[PDB]
Design a protein around this motif. Structure first.
Motif, PDB file in Angstrom:
ATOM      1  N   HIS A 256       0.813  -1.195   0.000  1.00  0.00           N
ATOM      2  CA  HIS A 256       0.000   0.000   0.000  1.00  0.00           C
ATOM      3  C   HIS A 256       0.851   1.251   0.000  1.00  0.00           C
ATOM      4  O   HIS A 256       2.003   1.241   0.430  1.00  0.00           O
ATOM      5  N   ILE A 257       0.282   2.321  -0.532  1.00  0.00           N
ATOM      6  CA  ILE A 257       0.958   3.603  -0.612  1.00  0.00           C
ATOM      7  C   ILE A 257       0.174   4.631   0.186  1.00  0.00           C
ATOM      8  O   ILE A 257      -1.030   4.825  -0.042  1.00  0.00           O
ATOM      9  N   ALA A 258       0.868   5.289   1.112  1.00  0.00           N
ATOM     10  CA  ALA A 258       0.252   6.294   1.961  1.00  0.00           C
ATOM     11  C   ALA A 258       1.234   7.403   2.336  1.00  0.00           C
ATOM     12  O   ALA A 258       2.452   7.219   2.294  1.00  0.00           O
ATOM     13  N   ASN A 259       0.683   8.557   2.698  1.00  0.00           N
ATOM     14  CA  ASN A 259       1.463   9.722   3.107  1.00  0.00           C
ATOM     15  C   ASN A 259       1.476   9.780   4.627  1.00  0.00           C
ATOM     16  O   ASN A 259       0.417   9.766   5.256  1.00  0.00           O
ATOM     17  N   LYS A 260       2.669   9.845   5.215  1.00  0.00           N
ATOM     18  CA  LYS A 260       2.791   9.889   6.668  1.00  0.00           C
ATOM     19  C   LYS A 260       3.214  11.263   7.173  1.00  0.00           C
ATOM     20  O   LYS A 260       3.789  12.065   6.433  1.00  0.00           O
ATOM     21  N   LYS A 261       2.926  11.516   8.447  1.00  0.00           N
ATOM     22  CA  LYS A 261       3.277  12.779   9.091  1.00  0.00           C
ATOM     23  C   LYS A 261       4.754  12.772   9.463  1.00  0.00           C
ATOM     24  O   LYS A 261       5.250  11.811  10.047  1.00  0.00           O
ATOM     25  N   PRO A 262       5.481  13.845   9.125  1.00  0.00           N
ATOM     26  CA  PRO A 262       6.911  13.930   9.441  1.00  0.00           C
ATOM     27  C   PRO A 262       7.205  13.786  10.937  1.00  0.00           C
ATOM     28  O   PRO A 262       6.328  14.014  11.782  1.00  0.00           O
ATOM     29  N   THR A 263       8.442  13.408  11.255  1.00  0.00           N
ATOM     30  CA  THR A 263       8.858  13.224  12.642  1.00  0.00           C
ATOM     31  C   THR A 263      10.304  13.663  12.879  1.00  0.00           C
ATOM     32  O   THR A 263      11.031  14.000  11.940  1.00  0.00           O
TER      33      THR A 263
END
Length: 228
Positions: free
Chosen positions: A221-228
């Motif tokens: 799957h392809i998804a956009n994550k929140k930076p850390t």
């Protein structure tokens, strides 16, 4: 009889990322001296490391539980006519394993990550096996080994409901805890901005990917994550 001592710099590592460093065996040893690499004050290396005597490579893949500093002792010994290994030298350095971080996208700009769910258990795999798995994923990800992440599944979540693209694998039953092998595709991408992923999606469903990796594939799957 002037002995020489060799210093080795300290190393750094990150959970879920490949680690490999060259050990200067030539300086520590001489023609007939046996090399020993392990955790300081121990016969074995930390559970996440592996030593390759002939290539002089210390490599591994750290799990969340390997967080911390590891003291690695490299010693040179001579063989006595009796077969007993006589301590000759010993250099010691450490390797700090940082929490799932990743040593880029604009701060506020999420990362587009492609994830591959595998029916495996990293805790039941030798570090070498973890390295080989990553290595085998290159033909599909087209991303260098050190640039891929590989961590266990948590709380039995075999999917990301926030993915805007996903596909199936070849597995019908998930037997192990599960592993997540992912890598970065770009910054804040959408279905249109994403590159061609047929080279991942096709092999995955047909079984060609699992056949190469050595483990069943549950899906991707392809998804956009929140930076850390």
């Amino acid at each position: 009889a002037v002995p020489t001592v060799v210093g080795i710099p300290d190393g750094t590592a990150v959970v879920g990322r490949s680690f490999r460093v060259s050990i200067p065996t030539d300086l520590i040893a001489s023609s007939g001296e046996i090399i020993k690499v392990s955790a300081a004050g121990k016969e074995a290396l930390p559970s996440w490391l592996h030593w390759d005597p002939h290539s002089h490579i210390l490599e591994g893949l750290p799990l969340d539980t390997d967080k911390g500093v590891h003291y690695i002792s490299v010693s040179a010994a001579r063989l006595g006519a009796n077969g007993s290994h006589v301590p000759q030298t010993s250099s010691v350095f450490s390797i700090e394993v940082y929490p799932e971080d990743h040593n880029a996208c604009a701060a506020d700009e999420p990362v587009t990550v492609l994830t591959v769910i595998l029916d495996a258990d990293l805790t039941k795999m030798t570090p070498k096996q973890r390295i080989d798995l990553l290595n085998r994923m290159q033909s599909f990800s087209e991303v260098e080994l050190h640039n891929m992440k590989l961590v266990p599944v948590v709380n039995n979540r075999l999917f990301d409901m926030s993915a805007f693209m996903a596909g199936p694998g070849n597995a019908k039953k998930v037997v192990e805890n599960g592993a997540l092998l992912s890598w970065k595709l770009g910054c804040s991408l959408n279905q249109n901005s994403v590159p061609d992923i047929r080279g991942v999606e096709t092999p995955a469903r047909e079984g060609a990917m699992s056949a190469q990796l050595g483990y069943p594939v549950v899906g991707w799957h392809i998804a956009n994550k929140k930076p850390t």
